[PDB]
Protein backbone atom coordinates (compact mmCIF):
# COMPACT_ATOMS: atom_id res chain seq x y z
CA UNK A 1 0.00 0.00 0.00
CA UNK A 2 0.81 3.65 -0.53
CA UNK A 3 -0.41 5.41 2.53
CA UNK A 4 -0.93 8.98 3.77
CA UNK A 5 2.37 10.09 5.12
CA UNK A 6 1.14 11.11 8.63
CA UNK A 7 -0.13 7.53 9.17
CA UNK A 8 0.98 5.27 12.02
CA UNK A 9 0.93 1.52 11.94
CA UNK A 10 -2.12 1.23 14.33
CA UNK A 11 -3.88 3.63 11.95
CA UNK A 12 -2.83 1.64 8.86
CA UNK A 13 -3.84 -1.55 10.66
CA UNK A 14 -7.33 -0.26 11.74
CA UNK A 15 -7.66 1.08 8.24
CA UNK A 16 -6.82 -2.01 6.21
CA UNK A 17 -8.97 -4.03 8.66
CA UNK A 18 -11.98 -1.69 8.48
CA UNK A 19 -12.19 -1.84 4.72
CA UNK A 20 -11.18 -5.06 3.02
CA UNK A 21 -12.95 -6.76 5.94
CA UNK A 22 -9.62 -8.29 6.54
CA UNK A 23 -7.31 -8.75 9.51
CA UNK A 24 -3.67 -7.79 9.80
CA UNK A 25 -0.74 -9.62 11.38
CA UNK A 26 1.73 -6.71 11.08
CA UNK A 27 2.42 -3.46 9.23
CA UNK A 28 5.81 -2.36 8.09
CA UNK A 29 6.29 1.17 6.66
CA UNK A 30 8.86 3.12 4.73
CA UNK A 31 9.03 6.42 2.99
CA UNK A 32 9.76 6.10 -0.73
CA UNK A 33 12.22 8.69 -2.04
CA UNK A 34 9.29 10.79 -3.34
CA UNK A 35 7.56 11.23 0.04
CA UNK A 36 5.02 8.49 -0.54
CA UNK A 37 4.81 6.28 2.52
CA UNK A 38 4.66 2.59 1.62
CA UNK A 39 3.34 0.08 4.07
CA UNK A 40 3.38 -3.60 3.32
CA UNK A 41 0.86 -5.41 5.38
CA UNK A 42 1.16 -9.08 6.33
CA UNK A 43 -2.30 -10.69 6.54
CA UNK A 44 -3.00 -13.40 9.14
CA UNK A 45 -2.39 -17.02 7.93
CA UNK A 46 -6.10 -18.10 7.92
CA UNK A 47 -6.56 -15.48 5.25
CA UNK A 48 -5.19 -14.96 1.73
CA UNK A 49 -3.68 -12.07 -0.14
CA UNK A 50 -4.07 -13.55 -3.60
CA UNK A 51 -7.85 -13.60 -3.15
CA UNK A 52 -8.14 -10.14 -1.54
CA UNK A 53 -6.11 -8.75 -4.45
CA UNK A 54 -8.95 -9.62 -6.85
CA UNK A 55 -11.58 -8.21 -4.54
CA UNK A 56 -9.82 -4.80 -4.31
CA UNK A 57 -9.33 -5.03 -8.08
CA UNK A 58 -5.54 -5.19 -8.30
CA UNK A 59 -3.58 -7.95 -10.03
Partner 1 sequence: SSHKTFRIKRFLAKKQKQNRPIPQWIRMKTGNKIRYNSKRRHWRRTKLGL
Partner 2 sequence: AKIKARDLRGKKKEELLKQLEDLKVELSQLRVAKVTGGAASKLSKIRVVRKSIARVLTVINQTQKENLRKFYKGKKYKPLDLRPKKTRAMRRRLNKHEENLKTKKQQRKERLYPLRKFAVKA
The residues that touch RNA, with contacts defined as CB under 7 A, are 4, 8, 10-11, 14, 35
Instruction: Considering only residues 13 through 52, tell me which ones interact with partner 1, judged by CB under 8 A.
Output: 31, 33-35
Residues near 40 by Cβ (< 8 Å), separated by ≥ 6? Answer: 1, 27, 28
Shortest separation between residue 8's beta carbon and RNA, angstroms: 5
Angle at 27 between CA 23 and CA 29, to 5 degrees: 150
Shortest separation between residue 57's beta carbon and RNA, angstroms: 17
- Tally the residues of the chain: 59
Shortest separation between residue 41's beta carbon and RNA, angstroms: 15
Amino acid sequence: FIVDVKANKHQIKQAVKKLYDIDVAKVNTLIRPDGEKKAYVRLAPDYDALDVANKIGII
